[PDB]
Amino acid sequence: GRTCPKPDDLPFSTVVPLKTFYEPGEEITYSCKPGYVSRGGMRKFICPLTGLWPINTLKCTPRVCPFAGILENGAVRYTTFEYPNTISFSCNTGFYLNGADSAKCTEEGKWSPELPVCAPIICPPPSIPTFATLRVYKPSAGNNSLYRDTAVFECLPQHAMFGNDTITCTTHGNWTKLPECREVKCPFPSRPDNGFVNYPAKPTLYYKDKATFGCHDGYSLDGPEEIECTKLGNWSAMPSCKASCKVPVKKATVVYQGERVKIQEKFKNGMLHGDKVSFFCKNKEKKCSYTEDAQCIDGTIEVPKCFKEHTDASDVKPC
Ligand SMILES: *[C@@H]1O[C@H](CO)[C@@H](O[C@@H]2O[C@H](CO)[C@@H](O[C@@H]3O[C@H](CO)[C@@H](O)[C@H](O)[C@@H]3O)[C@H](O)[C@H]2NC(C)=O)[C@H](O)[C@H]1NC(C)=O
Ligand SMILES: *[C@@H]1O[C@H](CO)[C@@H](O[C@H]2O[C@H](CO)[C@@H](O)[C@H](O)[C@H]2NC(C)=O)[C@H](O)[C@H]1NC(C)=O
Ligand SMILES: *[C@@H]1O[C@H](CO)[C@@H](O)[C@H](O)[C@H]1NC(C)=O
Ligand SMILES: *[C@@H]1O[C@H](CO)[C@@H](O)[C@H](O)[C@H]1NC(C)=O
Number of domains in the chain: 5
For residue 141, list its beta bridge partners. Answer: 143, 144
Contact 118, 105 (CB under 8 A): no
Query: Looking at beta carbons, which pairs linking 303-308 to residues 24 or more positions away fall under 8 Å?
Result: 303/248, 303/249, 303/279, 304/279, 306/281, 306/282, 307/249, 307/252, 307/279, 307/280, 307/281, 308/281, 308/282
Residues in contact with 76: Cβ distance below 8 Å, sequence separation at least 6, in sequence order:
68, 69, 70, 87, 88, 89
Dist CA 36 CA 84 (whole Å): 9
147 and 95: one domain?
A: no
313 and 257: one domain?
A: yes
Choose the residue to mutate in 230, 234, 236 for probing ligand 2, maximizing ligand atoms within 8 Å of C-beta.
Answer: 234
113 and 90: one domain?
A: yes
Residues in contact with 302: Cβ distance below 8 Å, sequence separation at least 6, in sequence order:
294
267 and 313: one domain?
A: yes
CA of residue 163 to ligand 4 center, whole Å: 9
Sign of CA dihedral 274, 280, 281, 283: positive
Give nearest CA residue, ligand 3 atom 11.
142
Residues in contact with 27: Cβ distance below 8 Å, sequence separation at least 6, in sequence order:
44, 45, 46, 47
Give nearest CA residue, ligand 2 atom 2.
234
Residues in contact with 263: Cβ distance below 8 Å, sequence separation at least 6, in sequence order:
247, 249, 251, 252, 253, 254, 256, 277
Please report, as a single letter, which amino acid is at residue 203. Answer: P
282 and 312: one domain?
A: yes
224 and 250: one domain?
A: no
Q: Does residue 164 have its Cβ closer than 6 Å to ligand 4? A: yes
User: Alpha carbon 188 to chain centroid distance?
Assistant: 40
Nearest CA to 78 out of 107, 119, 115 is that of 115
Burial (CB count within 10 angstroms: exposed 0-12, middle 13-18, buried 19+), residue 77: exposed
Boundary residue ending a domain (205, 228, 243)? 243
221 and 255: one domain?
A: no
User: Alpha carbon 153 to chain centroid distance?
Assistant: 20
4 and 39: one domain?
A: yes
CA of residue 174 to ligand 4 center, whole Å: 17
**Pure H helices in 142-289:** 263-266
Nearest bound ligand to CA 231? 2
Burial (CB count within 10 angstroms: exposed 0-12, middle 13-18, buried 19+), residue 137: middle
User: Alpha carbon 265 to chain centroid distance?
Assistant: 53
Resolution to 1 decimal, in Å? 2.7
Boundary residue ending a domain (158, 183, 208)? 183
Contact 30, 39 (CB under 8 A): no
191 and 230: one domain?
A: yes
Taking CA 235 as the corner, what is the angle to CA 232 and CA 236, rounded to the nearest 5 degrees?
A: 95
Q: Does residue 231 have its Cβ closer than 6 Å to ligand 2? A: no
Contact 259, 285 (CB under 8 A): no
Q: Does residue 174 have its Cβ closer than 6 Å to ligand 1? A: yes
Minimum-distance ligand 2 atom for the alpha carbon of 238: 28
Q: Does residue 300 have its Cβ closer than 6 Å to ligand 4? A: no
Q: Does residue 170 have its Cβ closer than 6 Å to ligand 4? A: no
Boundary residue ending a domain (13, 43, 62)? 62
Dist CA 39 CA 54 (whole Å): 18
155 and 117: one domain?
A: no
Q: Does residue 77 have its Cβ closer than 6 Å to ligand 1? A: no
Residues in contact with 152: Cβ distance below 8 Å, sequence separation at least 6, in sequence order:
134, 135, 136, 137, 165, 166, 167
Query: Looking at beta carbons, which pairs linking 154-157 to residues 24 or more positions away fall under 8 Å?
Result: 155/131, 155/181, 156/131, 156/132, 156/181, 157/206
- Where residue 151 sits, what CATH number does that domain have? 2.10.70.10
Helix (H, G, I), strand (E, B) or coil at 165: coil
165 and 201: one domain?
A: no
Dist CA 283 CA 316 (whole Å): 10
Residue 75 CB-half CA count within 13 A: 3
How many residues make up the chain in this entry?
A: 319
Nearest CA to 62 out of 85, 35, 42, 41 is that of 35
Helix (H, G, I), strand (E, B) or coil at 126: coil
216 and 238: one domain?
A: yes
Nearest bound ligand to CA 124? 3
Type and span of the H or E element at 112: strand 111-112
Helix (H, G, I), strand (E, B) or coil at 216: coil
**Determination technique for this entry:** X-ray
**Pure H helices in 25-160:** none
Domain span at 226? 184-243
Distance set, CA 85 to CA 11, 33, 108, 138 (Å): 18, 15, 13, 46
